[PDB]
Design a protein around this ligand. Structure first.
Ligand SMILES: O=C(O)c1ccc(-c2ccc(F)c(Cl)c2)o1
Ligand SMILES: O=C(O)c1ccc(-c2ccc(F)c(Cl)c2)o1
Length: 123
């Protein structure tokens, strides 16, 4: 699959954070996933995602999507299409992007590397 960066929705991260563009269904790569410290509740997963241009670590999976991480694909390097998300703003001004529906387009094993050379998005 030549031109790998062409597989990702370059600019979607900026669109999500500067426009609050929500009527997009961007294709992103998972760079990393880690659990967040939660007390008793179901675990919550934070994701570092890439659009080919930028990475952003403010993504959180909706708890209903937990089985994707625990049982199925969802792991570093996979390529996913985000079908539903919402942005939430914390009292301190930071924004978190909650992933509500997503589809794994390519498994981690089928991609195998971080696509392109994305740099961290600022703010
Ligand atoms: O253990 C962690 O990784 C963790 C705990 C809490 C947060 C967090 C809180 C507010 C935010 F906006 C973002 Cl991006 C992250 O990350
Ligand atoms: O369905 C869910 O699991 C859900 C809906 C909204 C949130 C949420 C809202 C603010 C946050 F900071 C974090 Cl981490 C999550 O999680």
């Amino acid at each position: 699959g030549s031109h790998m960066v062409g597989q990702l929705s370059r600019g979607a991260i900026a669109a999500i954070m500067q426009k609050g563009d929500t009527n997009i269904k961007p294709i992103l790569q998972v760079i990393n996933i880690r659990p967040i410290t939660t007390g008793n509740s179901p675990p919550r997963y934070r994701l570092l995602m890439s659009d080919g241009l930028n990475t952003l670590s403010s993504f959180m999976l909706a708890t209903q999507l937990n089985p994707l991480v625990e049982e199925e694909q969802l792991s570093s390097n996979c390529v996913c299409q985000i079908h539903r998300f919402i942005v939430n703003t914390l009292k301190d001004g930071r924004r978190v992007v909650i992933l509500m529906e997503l589809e794994v387009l390519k498994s981690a094993e089928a991609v195998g590397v971080k696509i392109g050379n994305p740099v961290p998005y600022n703010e």
